[PDB]
Design a protein around this nucleic acid. Structure first.
Ligand code: MG
Ligand code: MG
Ligand code: MG
Ligand code: MG
Ligand code: MG
Ligand code: MG
Ligand code: MG
Ligand code: MG
Ligand code: MG
Ligand code: MG
Ligand code: MG
Ligand code: MG
Ligand code: MG
Ligand code: MG
Ligand code: MG
Ligand code: MG
Ligand code: MG
Ligand code: MG
Ligand code: MG
Ligand code: MG
Ligand code: MG
Ligand code: MG
Ligand code: MG
Ligand code: MG
Ligand code: MG
Ligand code: MG
Ligand code: MG
Ligand code: MG
Ligand code: MG
Ligand code: MG
Ligand code: MG
Ligand code: MG
Ligand code: MG
Ligand code: MG
Ligand code: MG
Ligand code: MG
Ligand code: MG
Ligand code: MG
Ligand code: MG
Lengths: 77, 149
RNA sequence: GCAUCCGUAGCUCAGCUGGAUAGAGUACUCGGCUCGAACCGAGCGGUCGGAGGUUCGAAUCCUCCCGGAUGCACCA
RNA sequence: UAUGAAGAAGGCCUUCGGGUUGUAAAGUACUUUCAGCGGGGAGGAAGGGAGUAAAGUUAAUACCUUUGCUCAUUGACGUUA
RNA sequence: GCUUGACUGCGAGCGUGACGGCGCGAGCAGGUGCGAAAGCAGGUCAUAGUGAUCCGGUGGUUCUGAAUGGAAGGGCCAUC
RNA sequence: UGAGCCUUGAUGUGUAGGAUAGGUGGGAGGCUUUGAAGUGUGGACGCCAGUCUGCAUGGAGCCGACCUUGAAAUACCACCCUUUAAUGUUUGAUGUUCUAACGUUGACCCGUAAUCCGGGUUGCGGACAGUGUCUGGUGGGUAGUUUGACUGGGGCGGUCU
RNA sequence: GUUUAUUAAAAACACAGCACUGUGCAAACACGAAAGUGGACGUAUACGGUGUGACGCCUGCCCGGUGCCGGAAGGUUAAUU
RNA sequence: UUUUGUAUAAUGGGUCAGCGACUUAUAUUCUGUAGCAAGGUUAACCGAAUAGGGGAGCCGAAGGGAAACCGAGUCUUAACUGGGCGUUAAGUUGCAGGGUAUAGACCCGAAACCCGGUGAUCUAGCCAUGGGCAGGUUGAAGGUUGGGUAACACUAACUGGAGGACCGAACCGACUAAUGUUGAAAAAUUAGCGGAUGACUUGUGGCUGGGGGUGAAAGGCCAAUCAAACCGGGAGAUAGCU
RNA sequence: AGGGUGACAGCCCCGUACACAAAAAUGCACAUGCUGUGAGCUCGAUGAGUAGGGCGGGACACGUGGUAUCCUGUCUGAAUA
RNA sequence: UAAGGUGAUAUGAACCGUUAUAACCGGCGAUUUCCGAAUGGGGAAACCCAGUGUGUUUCGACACACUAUCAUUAACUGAAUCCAUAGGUUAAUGAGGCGAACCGGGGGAACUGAAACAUCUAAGUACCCCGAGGAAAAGAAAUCAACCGAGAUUCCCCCAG
């Protein structure tokens, strides 16, 4: 499903407003993208379904560090 | 996306130069080909250590350069035994090989490559100034004479 | 409720692009010639939307209005 | 190297009008051969030596000598092409 | 002819509406105008010319100001 | 290739004129081997009037400057404006070429007894496409509703203070 | 031929034919939050939609209105800055 | 019962028996009553506990003003001789009752909306695999053999067996009329009628699910129910109406 | 206390008040023994794509309102005793 | 614990007991067909069809045991592709389903009220889904206060309509 493998972002629900404040139910989905990340330690490309916010944290945290948390999370990358 | 160069990629600079660059560039091209490394605490310090270590290498070599220089610069004149010039005109040329051997026997070892015979090939007999390019820039100066054989 | 812009022979418009002074086509008169068509050139037909400012000087720039337009807003 | 005419001036001739030098210059773009300097860098280098291991060679295959190999090799020119 | 009473704060007592409300009002205080003054003037001979509340806008205001000093915002007055 | 900005230079006629005085001042100063003025056209711009000025040129000159001019002058210095020529910068606009993201419902290999899927190889495409957030337009495609009362029944007509 | 099973079998619907229009195939379109499937294991001599409704003779005029298509200079205009 | 008005030929009721509709909680106001009284009273809780404790609070004894503030006064205004609101007047806590408020709010009754499920054993379409269609006619193309042509074309005869072809049983449909209408039957029977090798019909399975399906299209059909199925839930929806 | 007994039972019966009961299993609590478990002191360190912000919503009694605070789909992004 | 006793409709028959192995009650075991998470495969639930291994023999067979999936862990092997990795085969553990309400979380109406109706109300209610426990959740101040202080969370009465 539409779940980020790094941040865990999942769809949330809200309201469409209007000039008359009419509220209609909607969904907010993450900006997910399938990317092949180069992991140096295994000299391999591993494909992850990540959000755009997740992409920013990968540079800051390091590719190895995030995967270590993923193995702790048992997300089965 | 700060990243430390490992070579002279395009115009980004040269090995060991943290530079701000668009994420994509390194996120999928520079790093997976090994042309550079992300600018992280561990990596940056190691490269800066490599930077300062080569600076120390530069220091040490140029330090030992002035060593050789002074060793032989201050006087340290040497003379060689060349076939009696006979009223002048020497009976042979004094080449880099022979002149290097002379200073080497004195102790200060010099390779002929380094030797630079200024304004001539030591043709006359008697005293004649010389010079030695001890280092890549440092210039020296030695007095060399000639006598009987 | 603001913000911007426009106003010039009868008409359609240049604005004499922002002060060192009004132009054209059309309307009309005469003429050129010519039965009318049709052609041409002169002449005539504007004080420049109005009122305050500035400077030695603005229809032209400033203030104020009038009329027109386009915008905005917008849930008494 | 190209542009470059006011056919510059000046020179010389002059039929005193001119022409000639001559787009030559100046100027304005352009390029840096070689020579300046600096930094790299072939080729000439085959060799033997030291070792090795096998083979031929023996009474002993010791002696050698033939292979292969292994390590370290050498350039006067030469601040080389 | 001269003028701004088309005044400000109020208002005894009345009228008329189911109410919201609407109408009339001598007199009082402060300041005016016209008259020499007595006096008259709180718009127009009178009765139609109009729209509650909420929300927002403008001016004024020592009323308020979520620890305190301000401020925002709110209140009140004038007013759209 | 636009453009905000970088600095420089330069530009500045009412007329009168002293006229290449934009305005605004200070302003008898100015002027000066640093080369007195200065010759060589240095050109540009501009009134094509004139002006500054490229390197030499020679050797003491050089200049405020009355009628007038609003003003008093490219004598003079400061400060702005205009005109801006070039200069870096900072953002964009296209166009071209790449590959490395991404795409492949192209080929091939493996998982594999497999027209799925995944991985690998390769080709093609490629910073598009596609997707997310935000946003303009469109949208009976689909919803939630409204669509008044009086009235010789209602509707129509008329009326509502 | 089909249709209102249970008051209407028709002139209604369908029909072959005709025309317009969309669609270049990871097709349009449709069902699906999506994957995917149908279209189609088809490829414009194909498929979808629309109207007309064998055949015969024919199908005139209007693009102002409303749609659709093409154009893109200008006017106006969102998020953003 | 409803009405201006009912013996009314307006509604209701075959009869009896049973059942069947003004309640409950909290808060508030008013009346009655009891207690205490410028005071009254506790709530939760504690507690051998209907006591007692607990005064946390609540109401009242002081109001005026938007408020700051002032205060038996206060506001309005510069100020009121003024005017508005106040100042002599007992309240409070139980109990009962009359009301109100929030809850279904006396009871019964909608057509509907929403949510989650069950249904294509009926029917509609489609898919797969099987079956059925007596008998009798008409006699296409093609073919053969002649005649004709240079060869065709063409023509004749004979073979052939084409068709959403013909007549007509099974089968399928359902046009007319009669009967039947508290039926034999919640759609049929009788006598006639249409199709009857096809866009036919049928068996057995399968698939499409409710704002959806399916529909040679009637708003038809989707379990005797369809301009939005059935079941349960929201739910005792709501009902200025009877 | 109740129930039963041929009609209404303190003394008919079963019970009730009291007084007692567990081979075995088990709850609870205390004690205790093992198996882990680490107490204390000093010196350090002090949670970053986070807080905050822009955009769109939601939650706080509080409906964007002048709206703090909390959660974040999106785009950014600190200080750090 | 016992002089009576073989459950009921529900008699009867044939019997068992009477001083402690009748019966009855309790504790602990044994047995516990088939279906059902159902687990060897399949299936129209209570049925159909096996494989492996051990042990039986009357040579026709027979009796037990094991064989689901997923998660986790560890071994062994094992691609494209050299290592690797994916993958594969075993072995251990664990989970599967059911069940009243209460709880946390993920989704989430409309009727209705507003005398209509959109904001709002109903209501984060009904319902659906996930997960857990005997309780759950929350919880040890980047909290409140107001210049005085309080000192985690939860619950009740007030504050207060
Ligand atoms: Mg050279
Ligand atoms: Mg009058
Ligand atoms: Mg405050
Ligand atoms: Mg509608
Ligand atoms: Mg509604
Ligand atoms: Mg009416
Ligand atoms: Mg009505
Ligand atoms: Mg027919
Ligand atoms: Mg019918
Ligand atoms: Mg039918
Ligand atoms: Mg019929
Ligand atoms: Mg038709
Ligand atoms: Mg036509
Ligand atoms: Mg048109
Ligand atoms: Mg047209
Ligand atoms: Mg009567
Ligand atoms: Mg009667
Ligand atoms: Mg008490
Ligand atoms: Mg007290
Ligand atoms: Mg008073
Ligand atoms: Mg009382
Ligand atoms: Mg009462
Ligand atoms: Mg037929
Ligand atoms: Mg027929
Ligand atoms: Mg027939
Ligand atoms: Mg039906
Ligand atoms: Mg409906
Ligand atoms: Mg129902
Ligand atoms: Mg309800
Ligand atoms: Mg009801
Ligand atoms: Mg901290
Ligand atoms: Mg932020
Ligand atoms: Mg926000
Ligand atoms: Mg508001
Ligand atoms: Mg406001
Ligand atoms: Mg806020
Ligand atoms: Mg099984
Ligand atoms: Mg309503
Ligand atoms: Mg438990």
């Amino acid at each position: 499903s539409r779940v980020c493998q790094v941040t865990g972002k999942r769809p949330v629900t809200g309201n469409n407003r209007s000039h008359a404040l009419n509220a209609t139910k909607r969904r907010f989905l993450p900006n997910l993208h399938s990317h092949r990340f180069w992991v140096e330690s295994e000299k391999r490309f591993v494909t992850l379904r990540v959000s755009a916010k997740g992409m920013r944290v990968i540079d800051k945290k390091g590719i190895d560090t995030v995967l270590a948390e993923l193995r702790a999370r048992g997300e089965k990358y | 996306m700060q990243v430390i160069l490992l070579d002279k990629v395009a115009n980004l600079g040269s090995l060991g130069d943290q530079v701000n660059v668009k994420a994509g560039y390194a996120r999928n091209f520079l790093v997976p080909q090994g042309k550079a490394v992300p600018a992280t605490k561990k990596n940056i310090e190691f490269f800066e250590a490599r930077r300062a270590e080569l600076e120390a290498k530069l220091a040490e070599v140029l330090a030992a350069a002035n060593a050789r220089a002074e060793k032989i610069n201050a006087l340290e004149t040497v003379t060689i035994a060349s076939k009696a010039g006979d009223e002048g005109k020497l009976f042979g040329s004094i080449g880099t090989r022979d002149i290097a051997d002379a200073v080497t026997a004195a102790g200060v070892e010099v390779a002929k490559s380094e030797v630079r015979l200024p304004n001539g090939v030591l043709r006359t007999t008697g005293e004649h100034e010389v010079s030695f390019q001890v280092h890549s820039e440092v210039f020296a100066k030695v007095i060399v004479n000639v006598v009987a054989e």
